[PDB]
C-alpha cells in the first residue's frame, strides 16, 4: 500500500514532466516548421510573380 | 500418578509453545513495520528526483 500511494506521487510529477517534454519536442517544433512554411511559401510567390 | 504428571506437563508445554511461536515471528513483525517506512523512503528517493526534472 505503501508503495502504490507514493508512485501516485512519482506519476503526480510525471504528468508535468510530460506536460514540459511534450512541449519542448512537439509544440515549439510545430511552430518553427510553420514559420519556416510561411518564409518559403512567401519566397516562392515572390518568386513566381516577378517571373 | 502418570497420568496427573503427563495431563499437567501436556498443559504447561502449551502456553509455553504459543509463547514461543510468539517469539519467533514478533521479529518478522517489527521488519514488516520497519519496512514500510524503508520503502517509503526508498521510494521518495525517485520523487524528488522527478520533481526537479521539472
Same mark, same amino acid.
Given at each position: 500500500?505503501?508503495?502504490?500511494?507514493?508512485?501516485?506521487?512519482?506519476?503526480?510529477?510525471?504528468?508535468?514532466?510530460?506536460?514540459?517534454?511534450?512541449?519542448?519536442?512537439?509544440?515549439?517544433?510545430?511552430?518553427?516548421?510553420?514559420?519556416?512554411?510561411?518564409?518559403?511559401?512567401?519566397?516562392?510567390?515572390?518568386?513566381?510573380?516577378?517571373? | *500418578?502418570?497420568?496427573?504428571?503427563?495431563? &499437567?506437563? *501436556?498443559?504447561? *508445554?502449551?502456553?509455553?509453545?504459543?509463547?514461543?511461536?510468539?517469539?519467533?515471528?514478533?521479529?518478522?513483525? &517489527?521488519?514488516?513495520?520497519?519496512?514500510?517506512?524503508?520503502?517509503?523512503?526508498?521510494?521518495?528517493?525517485?520523487?524528488? &528526483?522527478?520533481?526537479?526534472?521539472?
Amino acid at each position: 500500500v505503501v508503495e502504490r500511494a507514493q508512485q501516485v506521487a512519482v506519476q503526480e510529477q510525471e504528468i508535468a514532466r510530460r506536460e514540459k517534454e511534450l512541449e519542448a519536442r512537439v509544440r515549439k517544433p510545430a511552430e518553427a516548421e510553420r514559420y519556416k512554411l510561411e518564409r518559403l511559401a512567401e519566397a516562392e510567390k515572390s518568386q513566381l510573380i516577378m517571373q | *500418578s502418570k497420568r496427573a504428571f503427563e495431563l &499437567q506437563k *501436556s498443559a504447561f *508445554s502449551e502456553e509455553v509453545n504459543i509463547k514461543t511461536a510468539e517469539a519467533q515471528l514478533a521479529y518478522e513483525l &517489527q521488519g514488516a513495520r520497519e519496512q514500510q517506512k524503508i520503502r517509503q523512503e526508498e521510494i521518495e528517493i525517485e520523487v524528488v &528526483q522527478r520533481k526537479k526534472q521539472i
